[PDB]
């Protein structure tokens, strides 16, 4: 289950479709359906925050997974 040249593809194209969209959202991205995808993949959802930091794929959670003290 390897060999997915589509998939580096596609997770800048939803980048992009939210970027379209408006923001560089998960959510964003949800909206922006429908969107590029070839394939559903639980793959490709570890695959794009991978390409996120290596690659640099700019895109939010929306989650405030930033977070301290619930002051801000």
Same mark, same amino acid.
């Given at each position: 289950g390897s060999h997915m040249?589509?998939?580096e593809r596609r997770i800048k194209? *939803?980048? +992009?479709l939210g970027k379209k969209k408006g923001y560089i959202t998960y959510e964003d991205i949800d909206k922006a359906f429908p969107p590029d995808f070839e394939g559903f993949d639980?793959? *490709?959802i570890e695959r794009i925050h991978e390409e996120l930091e290596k690659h640099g794929i700019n895109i939010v959670e929306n989650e405030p997974e930033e977070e301290?003290? +619930?002051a801000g």
């Open positions: 040249p589509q998939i194209k *939803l980048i +992009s639980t793959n *490709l301290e003290i +619930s």
